[PDB]
Design a binder for this molecule. Structure first.
Ligand SMILES: [Mg+2]
Ligand SMILES: [Mg+2]
Ligand SMILES: [Mg+2]
Ligand SMILES: [Mg+2]
Ligand SMILES: [Mg+2]
Ligand SMILES: [Mg+2]
Ligand SMILES: [Mg+2]
Ligand SMILES: [Mg+2]
Ligand SMILES: [Mg+2]
Ligand SMILES: [Mg+2]
Ligand SMILES: [Zn+2]
Lengths: 125, 127, 80, 60, 206, 24, 155, 98
RNA sequence: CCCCGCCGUUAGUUGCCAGCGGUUCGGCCGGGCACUCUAACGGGACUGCCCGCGAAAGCGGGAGGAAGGAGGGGACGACGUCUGGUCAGCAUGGCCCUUACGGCCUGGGCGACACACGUGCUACAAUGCCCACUACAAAGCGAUGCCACCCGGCAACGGGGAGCUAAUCGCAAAAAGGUGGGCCCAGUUCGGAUUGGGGUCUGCAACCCGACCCCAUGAAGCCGGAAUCGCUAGUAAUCGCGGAUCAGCCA
């Protein structure tokens, strides 16, 4: 509990729990458990306060986590928005950025479908 | 010294050498179950013996090469049935009506073009 | 996530051009068709007119952009 | 194709990664089975005239 | 739209390959290319010889053409003063010492490429197609032969709407392999577009 | 799933090797 | 079947109860040709029918099937007016197939996590006259009797 | 131990012509180890039948290559004194190691 | 004609507790081809035999047989139809352009996105996901190559470096499967879209517009309206493997 800022993950295995933190995933979980010596398997509620500190002292003092990340990412994007950059423009319009197609199939970045009219004088559609 | 039959099944070939004795079977330098470990079907490769009362009257040394384990299980069921018949040609009328002597012609069917999958026809629209 | 392992490719006919514009002054507008060319620190300040397929475009090179690529600032297509 | 585009003949084609195949028989730049240098049509036409040795009709 | 090539359909049995050598994958490609410039030189120069097929065999580096023709005269020339200009025009491009031959095609009326070549010839000289065909079937059906067929395409008569004129007698069993059915195709460039001439000749079974 | 690049299953599909599917 | 009568394929017998009803049932459990774990399911479910009921599973199983086989069913018939649920007999070959299916489908609506559990508990409930399968059966014969007025278009 | 791998495109003109390369005797003039079958290698071409669209048409071409072995023990030069002009297969190709 | 199913003759640098000897216990070595196999050539099925119906052709069933009436799969598409398709593969009549409707570059485009459909992939999980261990394929491809095995590296991959013109070396791991362990019903240890970051490789060159690796991110999706597609048996369904094209790749 309170392993990263505000992050209280509880009651699951400690390796799963840590992933409930922002800049922390299957990897860094595995890692920070090795480098601080806590068994992956133990439930979070079954943790020595002395262990929860070696965790916090590591995770918190060794990577950019939580809002401290979300902050950088946000300014990392405005960065290429301020300059003329092409990826910046794509971000500005809210279209794919990694050279994907946009004729079909861009829904996840585009959002839900903004349907318009079909024909004026043509076949059945 | 021993008794032999071949026996094949769907790209898998069994070599069955029968010797007299106890009942102990060894496929590919391994105990029977060491190989076919926990496959509900395995016991069925020995139905030739289980139906000539040869349970514990024969030992068997087998090598099997090809395909996958369930096909090998059938190839053995022939090899055993075939060796058992050059051991005793009177065993046929016992064994033939159970079919153990009929090699299973059923083989994987070829992939055709403009199909997905030898028969699986690709799906179409507007009709 | 991009590449060029060791060599950091920069089109050199432009490079000999820009380095030679630093014996003295910084010529306004440089006409390149090598959008293909990585930006380097020794380009800050000048103005490079990158093509387009259709027109050279006045790309004021700052220092925020010292690593990117010239074609990253000459947008090709015209949309709404 | 265009006769001018059998400038594939450029044994010196500047950069190497501009090399391309082209059917030696009808110029066809696409589907050009390289064992034969023939394209997919020329391949079938010659195969039916028996002019590619050892090349039978396949079936199985 | 249907119907294979009767030769391409029998190439394993009751017909063999127009060039029958061998090569690994580094060579096949070029040997074929040369192999074909041979046939291309041999079909422009040797037109009037009336050649049916052009067999090629290669072996220890060498080559071995066997030009089958109707009138082996015009390939020999004056005692031999023609068959050496060609055997030299060949070993020019083929830097590999060629070995020209000539095989007497007796019976120009039983080799399909000839039969067809002939009908296409008449068509350029503005002959009557219907008759041209019916005759060639006869000319072939007489000269031995268990059956035969001839197809001209369309623009028959310089006609504005392409047609297809037919004609065949005896047996011509295309779907049976035990057949032995020479097939020949002649083109026929005319003043008004092209015409295709196919000749089928069934001769004996097994 | 065969879509997670960093699984065993997911590597096999894309015919690759890596941390999440060592070569040998 | 526009020509011949299409013969029933004879399945091989069970390896543990020598019964071909069992192989019929292990087949309908099996998906994607995974036959191994289909047995591995059924058999595991069999050693749950004893460990909760002294009777050996083979009677409990065939008892359960019997409660699910239907005696009457409707099948819609096109008429010169519209559609008509028509009550029909049920061939004994089709009672076989209907009960085995409904068993395995009702088994997998059950909320028990392990699959053998679901089959076991469904096999028991059926043999006991209840559980989901026996509904969609008493439920079928209902409609056959509810549309008795039309039982005179019997194909 | 004269190893002579023989291959070509026509199996009639191999086995025939590898039968011809056994001529100090069947096994009464050298030794001979029987011509070895040795599997064939089948290259396959599949081609869209017509010239345009019709994706699902297709026609299959193979180019099989068959290989034989032979192998003679006692490479005496008397018997070798037959490999002069003693041949007749064209589209067969010969390889020799020892 | 081809392939698959049973059997033989020929054939032994692939195959063997066959049977022996030697064991670094590896078919490794001596040794043998019997077996499996490899690939050439034969045999074998004909309603021939049996009972029943039939005027016959045949139909039903029964023996024996590996296989029984078309044993299983391919190749094979009649006279003709659609004034079908294709002048952009190739030919080809006519028509037109002829310091440009021809040619060469460099850059862009064919990848544009408010939308709509076709075909697919991956899913929505416990008959499941994950990790470890362990086992059985067929067909292919390889010397401007396949790259065993070592070293750096979490890894892509770099360095080094054997064998292999390849039944002999390599791609090569098969994967579902099996044993053990984790997850416990959750938008989850389900799903892996999106985006941020750092990197390897191929290429003159990866902005537009490449694939792969690692870290973070972890979207929609809880089985799909009206409608609608495939398949009758080694078939569907499901699981992986290979090849053509190709530097690399959007497979
Ligand atoms: Mg398709
Ligand atoms: Mg042209
Ligand atoms: Mg290329
Ligand atoms: Mg996952
Ligand atoms: Mg296609
Ligand atoms: Mg036929
Ligand atoms: Mg059109
Ligand atoms: Mg396109
Ligand atoms: Mg759920
Ligand atoms: Mg059908
Ligand atoms: Zn071509």
């Amino acid at each position: 509990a309170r392993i990263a800022g505000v992050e209280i993950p509880r009651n699951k295995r400690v390796d799963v729990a840590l992933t409930y933190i922002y800049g922390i995933g299957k990897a860094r979980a595995k890692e920070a458990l090795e480098k601080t010596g806590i068994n992956p398997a133990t439930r979070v509620k079954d943790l020595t306060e002395a262990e929860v500190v070696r965790l916090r002292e590591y995770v918190e003092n060794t990577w950019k986590l939580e809002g401290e990340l979300r902050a950088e990412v946000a300014a990392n994007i405005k960065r290429l928005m301020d300059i003329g950059c092409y990826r910046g423009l794509r971000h500005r319009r809210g279209l794919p950025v990694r050279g994907q197609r946009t004729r079909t199939n861009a829904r996840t970045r585009k959002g839900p479908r903004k349907t318009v009219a079909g024909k004026k004088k043509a076949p059945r559609k | 010294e021993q008794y032999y039959g071949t026996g094949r099944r769907k790209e898998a070939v069994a070599r069955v050498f029968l010797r007299p004795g106890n009942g102990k079977v060894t496929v590919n330098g391994q105990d029977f179950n060491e190989y076919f470990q926990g496959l509900v079907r395995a016991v069925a490769a020995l139905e030739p013996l289980r139906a000539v009362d040869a349970l514990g009257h024969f030992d068997a040394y087998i090598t099997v090469r090809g395909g996958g384990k369930s096909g090998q299980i059938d190839a053995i069921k022939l090899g055993i049935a075939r060796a058992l018949v050059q051991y005793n040609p009177d065993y046929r009328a016992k064994l033939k009506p159970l079919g153990f002597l009929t090699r299973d012609a059923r083989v994987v069917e070829r992939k055709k073009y403009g199909k997905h999958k030898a028969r699986r026809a690709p799906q179409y629209s507007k009709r | 996530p991009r590449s060029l392992k060791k060599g950091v490719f920069v089109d050199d006919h432009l490079l000999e051009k820009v380095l030679e514009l630093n014996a003295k002054g910084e010529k306004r507008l440089i006409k390149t068709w090598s959008r293909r060319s990585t930006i380097v620190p020794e380009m800050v300040g000048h103005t490079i007119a990158v093509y387009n397929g259709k027109q050279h475009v006045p790309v004021y090179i700052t220092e925020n952009m010292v690593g990117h690529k010239l074609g990253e600032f000459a947008p090709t297509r015209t949309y709404r | 194709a265009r006769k001018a585009l059998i400038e594939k003949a450029k044994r010196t084609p500047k950069f190497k990664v501009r090399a391309y195949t082209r059917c030696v028989r009808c110029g066809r730049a696409r589907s050009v089975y390289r064992f034969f240098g023939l394209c997919r049509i020329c391949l079938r036409e010659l195969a039916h005239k028996g002019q590619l040795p050892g090349v039978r009709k396949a079936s199985w | 739209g249907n119907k294979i090539h009767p030769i391409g359909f029998r190439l394993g049995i009751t017909r063999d390959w127009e060039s029958r050598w061998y090569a690994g994958k580094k060579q096949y490609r070029h040997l074929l290319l040369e192999d074909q410039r041979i046939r291309g030189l041999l079909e422009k120069e040797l037109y009037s010889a009336g050649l049916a097929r052009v067999d090629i065999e290669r072996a220890a580096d060498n080559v071995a053409v066997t030009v089958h023709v109707a009138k082996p005269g015009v390939v020999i020339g004056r005692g031999g003063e023609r068959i050496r200009v060609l055997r030299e025009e060949l070993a020019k491009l083929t830097g590999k010492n060629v070995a020209l031959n000539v095989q007497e095609v007796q019976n120009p009326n039983l080799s399909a490429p000839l039969v067809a070549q002939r009908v296409a010839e008449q068509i350029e000289r503005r002959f009557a197609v219907r008759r041209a065909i019916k005759q060639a079937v006869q000319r072939v059906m007489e000269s031995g032969a268990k059956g035969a067929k001839v197809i001209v395409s369309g623009r028959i008569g310089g006609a504005e709407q392409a047609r297809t004129e037919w004609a065949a007698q005896g047996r011509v069993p295309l779907h049976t392999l035990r057949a032995n059915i020479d097939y020949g195709f002649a083109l026929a460039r005319t003043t008004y577009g092209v015409l295709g001439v196919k000749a089928y000749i069934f001769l004996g079974e097994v | 799933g065969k879509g997670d690049r960093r699984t065993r299953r997911g590597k096999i599909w894309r015919g690759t090797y890596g941390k999440y599917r060592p070569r040998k | 079947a526009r020509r011949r009568r299409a013969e029933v394929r004879q399945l091989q017998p069970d390896l543990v109860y020598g019964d071909v009803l069992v192989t019929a049932f292990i087949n309908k459990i099996m998906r994607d040709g995974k036959k191994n774990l289909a047995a591995r399911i059924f058999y595991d479910a069999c050693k749950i029918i004893q460990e909760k009921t002294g009777q050996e599973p083979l009677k409990v199983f065939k008892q359960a099937v019997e409660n699910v086989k239907p005696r009457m069913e409707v099948r819609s018939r096109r008429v010169g007016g519209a559609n008509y649920q028509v009550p029909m007999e049920v061939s004994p070959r089709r009672q076989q197939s209907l009960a085995l299916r409904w068993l395995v489908q009702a088994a997998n609506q059950r909320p028990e996590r392990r699959a053998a559990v679901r089959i076991a508990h469904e096999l028991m409930d059926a043999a006991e006259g209840k559980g989901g399968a026996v509904k969609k059966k008493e439920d079928v014969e209902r409609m056959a009797e509810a549309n008795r007025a039309y039982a005179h278009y019997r194909w | 131990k004269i190893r002579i791998k023989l291959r070509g495109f026509d199996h009639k003109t191999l086995d025939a012509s590898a039968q011809k390369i056994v001529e100090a005797a069947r096994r009464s003039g050298a030794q001979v180890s029987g011509p070895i079958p040795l599997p064939t290698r089948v290259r396959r071409f599949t081609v869209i039948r017509g010239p345009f669209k019709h994706k699902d048409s297709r026609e299959h071409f193979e180019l099989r290559t068959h290989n034989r072995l032979v192998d003679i023990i006692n490479p005496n030069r008397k018997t070798i004194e037959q490999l002069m002009t003693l041949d007749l297969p064209t589209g067969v190709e010969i390889e020799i190691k020892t």
